[PDB]
């Protein structure tokens, strides 16, 4: 019953980042997991998801640029981000789907020139 | 003070801006209409649909695994019989598409044979469930669907009264018929029973003895989800209450069933789980009326062409909140059904039961609801596939889940403001 995102920072447009999430077994094991983000002046937005069997799917705003993956041995969830845009600036959060009602602290990503 | 809150809790400032904006609220109500249609109008992409299907398949699977091993017998009043064989067709028996209830002298009951009364109850629910699964379940919003079900059993042996006028309702035992009706839901289900006698010497009678054959034909049987869940409940509770003796034939190498003899209600974890799934899907399906009763398709805005006042102009909010909460409750229960049975989180003997038997088929993919001579000892109810599809449907419900949470937060803000 814990979610710890990490990896975020300030990068340049065109850049890339790898986000991480250590999730507890409760949450992670046998569940669909996903990434969300919450941008200045907007509510939290769904971004990607991935089934236990590793099938990923994406919001149209990030398709073709972000890759979600999961490590079942270590209850880890990753989001590789490429070709970042200013519009990708946000707090990013992992959670299971459907959501566990307490969120982690999130990790800030700022894309800026 | 409020400014000091809308620093640290920044998304709450956004939520209040959205709640005062009639076009953001209408956008959220539109979303709710669309997520409802996904939940109750779709099949493959509805987590709710998949979870209902999963709960039904687990019950049917449980019996396909264990039915062949389950003693049954006696006569019509739950009495012991001295020489009765009663065979039920389209049932997953040992190397056979029938199950034979031929256990004599022993009194039917707990840790004994299943009476034929309970077996008939079981069988009928099984035949219905298999016929519906075979035709394919309708989406949750449909409840005027019906299906037509047919099944047969036979009675041979001295003194065997399981096919008599008294057991059956049928005027005359050779050639006779009877029609009765009842009302599953507020629906009329018509049942037609017919009885035929085949003598021992009668031509084309391989089995060297003479028997009565009963055919039941049911029409207008509800195939709605509420109705099918009620059938699976009957199936699983009959077994758990009758709690009959079983003993398995164990295959060389194979996957290994423990215990090998025992009583059927002794699979307590497996039966609890299935009962739980059925219960959770019943609650899930109940959210359907809440969604229908609180339609979200009329646009909202300030009356008398004057700006919208979230403190007075928002009596729709109660309804919006009930709707959003129902949709969210549906999704959480769907997920919860999946987690009850999913082998990733199971342990010990229950895990083997599920990975080595229940989520298995030995038929040779044959469509849903088919019973063959190799169905026994395997679920043959598409349990692994259904789990996978549930998860896929939930993965593809990412956006809608977030939109439902948002609509619920908006409505909840407006319900607060009107007080
Ligand atoms: C016990 C039974 O089923 N009795 C039948 C009887 O069957 C016997 C005969 O066919 C004889 C041959 O004359 O063969 C016997 O088996 C032989 C076999 O042929 C040999 O090759 C073998 O090696 O040995 C065995 C004997 O050991 C059969 O058992 O047939 C009659 C006529 O068909 C049948 O009665 C008819 O149908 C019933 C429903 C009724 O309407 C009668 O009026 C008809 O005559 C016998 O059934 C019983 O009939 C009784 C007559 O009093 C009672 O009515 C009783 O309720 C009937 O039993 C029920 O119906 C049976 C068909 C069967 O379903 C039973 O399980 C059930 O209890």
Q: What are phi and psi of B86, to 5 degrees?
A: -130, 115
Domain check: are B69 and B93 in the same one?
Answer: no
Please indicate whether residue B199, judged by its CB atom, sits closer than 6 Å to ligand 1: yes
Chain B residues close to A51, C-beta within 8 Å: 388, 391-392, 395
Q: Count Cβ atoms below 10 Å from residue B391 Cβ, excluding itself.
A: 25
Q: What is the CATH number of the domain that holds A112?
A: 2.60.40.10
Q: What are phi and psi of B302, to 5 degrees?
A: -70, 135
Instruction: Confirm or reject contact between A32 and chain B (CB < 8 A).
Output: yes
CA–CA gap between residue B403 and residue B34 (Å, rounded): 10
Size of interface A-B (CB pairs under 8 A): 64
CA distances to B74, B157, B214 from B82, in Å: 8, 9, 21
Contact A97 B406 (CB under 8 A): no
Contact B396 A57 (CB under 8 A): yes
**Region for B303 from its dihedrals, namely left if φ exceeds 0, alpha if ψ lies in -120 to 50, beta otherwise:** beta
Residue that finishes a domain, picked among B173, B206, B223? B223
Radius of gyration of chain B (CA): 27
Contacts of A1 (CB under 8 A, 6+ apart): A24, A26, A27, A100, A102
Resolution (A): 2.7
Domain check: are B183 and B230 in the same one?
Answer: no
CA–CA gap between residue A76 and residue A99 (Å, rounded): 17
- Closest Cα partner for A10 from A109, A91, A105, A113? A109
User: What is chain A's length?
Assistant: 113
Domain check: are B345 and B386 in the same one?
Answer: yes
**Residue B226, both tokens:** 């509420």
Domain check: are B159 and B47 in the same one?
Answer: no
**Residue B343, both tokens:** 């082998």
Quote the ligand 1 centre to B166 CA distance (angstroms). 18
Beta strands across the sheet bearing A17-23: A3-6, A17-23, A76-81, A66-71
CA–CA gap between residue A43 and residue B229 (Å, rounded): 38
β pairing state of A17-23 and A76-81: antiparallel
User: What is chain B's length?
Assistant: 419
Technique of determination: X-ray
CA–CA gap between residue A31 and residue A29 (Å, rounded): 6
- Closest Cα partner for B201 from B188, B210, B192, B213? B210
Instruction: Provide the domain limits for residue B407.
Output: 1-73+224-419
Domain check: are B69 and B83 in the same one?
Answer: no
**Residue B285, both tokens:** 């399906």
Cα of first residue to Cα of last residue in chain B, in angstroms, is 20
Q: How many domains does chain A have?
A: 1
Of B328, B391, B405, the CB nearest to A51: B391
For residues B156 and B169, the answer to whether their CB atoms sit within 8 Å is no
Domain check: are B260 and B348 in the same one?
Answer: yes
Please indicate whether residue B304, judged by its CB atom, sits closer than 6 Å to ligand 1: no
3-state secondary structure of A88: helix
Rounded-to-10 torsion of CA B294, B298, B300, B302: -120
Of B339, B396, B405, the CB nearest to A30: B339
β pairing state of A56-58 and A32-38: unpaired
Contacts of B4 (CB under 8 A, 6+ apart): none
Residue nearest ligand 1's atom 61 by CA: B211
Q: Give the residue carrying structure tokens 């009194």.
A: B107
β pairing state of B114-115 and B72-73: parallel
Domain check: are B275 and B183 in the same one?
Answer: no
Beta strands across the sheet bearing B177-182: B96-101, B85-93, B146-156, B211-222, B189-198, B177-182
Please indicate whether residue B210, judged by its CB atom, sits closer than 6 Å to ligand 1: yes
Please indicate whether residue B212, judged by its CB atom, sits closer than 6 Å to ligand 1: yes
Please indicate whether residue B153, judged by its CB atom, sits closer than 6 Å to ligand 1: no
Residue that finishes a domain, picked among B223, B238, B258? B223
Please, what is the Cα angle at B346 between B340 and B349, to 5 degrees? 115
3-state secondary structure of A27: helix
Q: Count Cβ atoms below 10 Å from residue B243 Cβ, excluding itself.
A: 19
Instruction: Provide the domain limits for residue A33.
Output: 1-113
CA–CA gap between residue B239 and residue B72 (Å, rounded): 11
Determine the residue among B402, B406, B407, B410 to mutate to test chain A binding: the one whose Cβ has the most chain A Cβ atoms within 10 Å.
Answer: B402
For residues B105 and B80, the answer to whether their CB atoms sit within 8 Å is yes
- Supply the angle between the helices B10-19 and B22-36 in degrees, to the nearest 10: 90
CA–CA gap between residue B38 and residue A69 (Å, rounded): 26
Last residue before each gap in chain B (C to N over 2.5 A): 364
Report the atom number in ligand 1 closest to the C-alpha of B158. Answer: 1
Domain check: are B182 and B266 in the same one?
Answer: no
In SS3 terms, chain B reads as: CCHHHHHHCHHHHHHHHHHCCHHHHHHHHHHHHHHHHHHHHCCCCCHHHHHHHHHHHHHHHHHHHHHHHECEECCCCCCCCCCCEEEEEEEEECCEEEEEECECCCCCCCCCCEEHHHHHHHHHHHHHHHHHHHHCCCCCCCCCCEEEEEEEEEEECCCCCCCCHHHHCCCCCCCCEEEEEECCCCCCEEEEEEEEEECCCCCCCCCCCCEEEEEEEEEEEECCHHHHHHHHHHHHHHHHHHCCEEECCCCCCCCCCCCCEEEHHHCHHHHHHHHHHHHHHHHHHHHHHHHHHCCCCCCCCCCCCCCCCCCCCCCCHHHHHHHHHHHHHHHHHHHHHHHHHCHHHCCHHHHHHHHHHHCCCCCCCCCCCCCCCCCCCCCCCCHHHHHHHHHHHHHCCHHHHHHHHHHHHHHHHHHHHCC
Domain check: are B128 and B207 in the same one?
Answer: yes
β partners of residue B31: none
CA–CA gap between residue B188 and residue B179 (Å, rounded): 13
Contact B391 A53 (CB under 8 A): yes
CA–CA gap between residue B355 and residue B349 (Å, rounded): 10
Domain check: are B347 and B248 in the same one?
Answer: yes
β partners of residue A48: A35, A58
**Residue B41, both tokens:** 């109008």
- Supply the angle between the helices B317-341 and B383-395 in degrees, to the nearest 10: 140
Q: Give the residue carrying structure tokens 């990708």.
A: A88
Quote the ligand 1 centre to B210 CA distance (angstroms). 6
Instruction: Confirm or reject contact between A41 and chain B (CB < 8 A).
Output: yes
Chain A residues close to B335, C-beta within 8 Å: 31, 97-98
Q: Count Cβ atoms below 10 Å from residue B42 Cβ, excluding itself.
A: 16
Q: Please, what sign has the CA dihedral across residues B34, B282, A31, B12?
A: positive
Tally of helices (H runs) and strands (E runs) in chain A: 1, 10
Q: Is the peptide bond before B69 cis (omega within 30 degrees of 0)?
A: no
Domain check: are B69 and B20 in the same one?
Answer: yes
User: Among all residues of chain A, which has the CA nearest to that of B333?
Assistant: A98
Domain check: are B158 and B273 in the same one?
Answer: no
Q: What are phi and psi of B194, to 5 degrees?
A: -140, 145
CA–CA gap between residue B375 and residue A92 (Å, rounded): 48
Quote the ligand 1 centre to B199 CA distance (angstroms). 7
Residue that finishes a domain, picked among B223, B248, B272? B223
Chain A residues close to B397, C-beta within 8 Å: 97
Of B345, B391, B402, the CB nearest to A44: B402
**Residue B245, both tokens:** 């003796």
């Amino acid at each position: 019953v814990q979610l710890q995102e990490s990896g975020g920072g300030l990068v340049q447009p065109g850049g890339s980042l790898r986000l991480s999430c250590a999730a507890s077994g409760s949450i992670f094991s046998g569940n669909v997991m996903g990434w969300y983000r919450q941008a200045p002046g907007k509510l939290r937005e769904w971004v990607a998801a991935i089934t236990p069997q590793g099938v990923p799917n994406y919001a149209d705003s990030v398709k073709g640029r972000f890759t979600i993956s999961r490590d079942n041995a270590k209850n880890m969830l990753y989001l590789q981000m490429s070709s970042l845009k200013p519009e990708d600036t946000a707090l990013y959060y992992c959670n299971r789907l459907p959501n566990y009602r307490s969120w982690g602290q999130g990790t800030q990503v700022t894309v800026s020139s | 003070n409020l400014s000091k809150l809308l620093t640290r809790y920044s998304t709450l400032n956004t939520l209040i801006k959205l709640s005062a904006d009639p076009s953001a609220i209408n956008a959220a109500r539109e979303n709710l209409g669309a997520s409802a249609k996904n939940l109750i109008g779709d099949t493959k992409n509805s987590p709710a649909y998949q979870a209902v299907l999963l709960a039904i398949n687990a019950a049917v699977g449980f019996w396909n695994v264990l039915g062949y091993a389950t003693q049954c017998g006696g006569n019509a009043n739950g009495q012991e019989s001295t020489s009765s064989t009663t065979i039920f067709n389209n049932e997953p028996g040992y190397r056979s598409t029938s199950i034979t209830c031929s256990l004599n002298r022993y009194k039917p009951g707990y840790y004994g044979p299943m009476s034929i009364e309970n077996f008939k109850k079981l069988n009928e629910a099984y035949q219905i469930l298999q016929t519906a699964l075979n035709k394919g379940l309708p989406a949750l919003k449909e409840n005027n669907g019906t299906v037509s079900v047919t099944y047969t059993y036979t009675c041979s042996g001295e003194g065997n009264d399981n096919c008599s006028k008294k057991a059956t309702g049928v005027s005359d035992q050779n050639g006779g018929t009877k029609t009765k009706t009842q009302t599953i839901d507020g629906k009329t289900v018509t049942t037609t029973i017919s009885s035929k006698v085949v003598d021992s010497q009668a031509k084309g009678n391989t089995t060297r003895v003479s028997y009565t054959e009963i055919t039941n034909k049911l029409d207008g049987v509800p195939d709605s989800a509420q109705a099918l869940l009620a059938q699976a409940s009957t199936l699983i509770n009959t077994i758990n209450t009758a709690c009959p003796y079983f003993s398995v034939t164990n295959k060389s190498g194979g996957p290994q069933m423990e215990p090998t003899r025992g009583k059927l209600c002794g699979f307590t974890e497996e039966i609890s789980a299935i009962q739980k799934m059925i219960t959770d899907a019943q609650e899930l399906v109940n959210q359907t009326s809440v969604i229908n009763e609180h339609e979200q398709s009329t646009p909202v805005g300030g009356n008398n062409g004057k700006p919208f006042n979230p403190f007075t102009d928002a009596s729709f909010a109660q309804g919006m909140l009930a709707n959003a909460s129902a949709q969210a409750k549906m999704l959480n229960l769907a997920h919860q059904v999946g987690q009850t049975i999913n082998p990733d989180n199971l342990t010990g003997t229950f895990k083997n039961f599920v990975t080595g038997f229940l989520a298995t088929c030995n038929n040779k993919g044959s469509p849903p609801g088919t019973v063959t001579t190799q169905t026994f000892a395997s679920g043959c109810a598409y349990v692994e596939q259904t789990i996978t599809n549930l998860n896929n449907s939930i993965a593809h419900f990412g956006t809608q889940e977030q939109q439902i949470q948002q609509a619920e937060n908006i409505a909840d803000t407006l319900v607060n403001f009107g007080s």
